[PDB]
Amino acid sequence: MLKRVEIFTDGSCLGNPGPGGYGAILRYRGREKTFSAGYTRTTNNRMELMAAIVALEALKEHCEVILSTDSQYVRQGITQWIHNWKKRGWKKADKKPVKNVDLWKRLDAALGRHKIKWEWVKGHAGHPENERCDELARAAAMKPKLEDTGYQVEV
């Protein structure tokens, strides 16, 4: 019987773009482990992705993951865009590069190593783990220690 793990993620910025942060809760057999980190300058989308990335990468063996988030950016990514992007070797129709391809590739990579089961949520109501993640992300964004080297900023 494959290890079953639940993952909750959320990421955001104190003004977008701006100081950002993410928070993830990885639960297993009633025991939970927290994950968080703050960056000097980044965007909401990157954080939403980072959260899922770090959590998934934390796993050290094949598992059955039940990933839950309220991020539409990640939702649409996984549900639609992600498939088409890979076909065109990571490049939109108008030849423009896909945004945050660095993090997307990383997420995809991590995803393929487990049996994911996505669960898209609406608000905080009836979703305590997620609310908690949001809390983690904000606190981390208050005093960021890391730096998002993959963030371009751009003129």
Curated annotation (Swiss-Prot):
Keywords: Cytoplasm, Endonuclease, Hydrolase, Magnesium, Metal-binding, Nuclease. Changing residue 10 to N: Loss of activity. Changing residue 70 to N: Loss of activity. Mg(2+) 1 binds at residues 10, 48, 70. SUPFAM superfamilies: Ribonuclease H-like. Belongs to the RNase H family. GO terms for biological process: DNA replication, removal of RNA primer. Monomer. It catalyses: Endonucleolytic cleavage to 5'-phosphomonoester. PANTHER family: RIBONUCLEASE H1. Endonuclease that specifically degrades the RNA of RNA-DNA hybrids. RNase H participates in DNA replication; it helps to specify the origin of genomic replication by suppressing initiation at origins other than the oriC locus; along with the 5'-3' exonuclease of pol1, it removes RNA primers from the Okazaki fragments of lagging strand synthesis; and it defines the origin of replication for ColE1-type plasmids by specific cleavage of an RNA preprimer. Involved in production of retron derived msDNA (a branched RNA linked by a 2',5'-phosphodiester bond to a single-stranded DNA). Residues 1-142 form the RNase H type-1 domain. Pfam families: RNase_H. The keyword Metal-binding applies. GO terms for molecular function: endonuclease activity; magnesium ion binding; nucleic acid binding; RNA-DNA hybrid ribonuclease activity. This is Ribonuclease HI. InterPro entries: RNase_H, RNaseH-like_sf, RNaseH_domain, RNaseH_sf, RNaseHI. Disruption phenotype: In a strain that encodes a retron, the msDNA is abnormally sized. It comes from Escherichia coli (strain K12). NCBIfam families: PRK00203.1. The gene is rnhA.
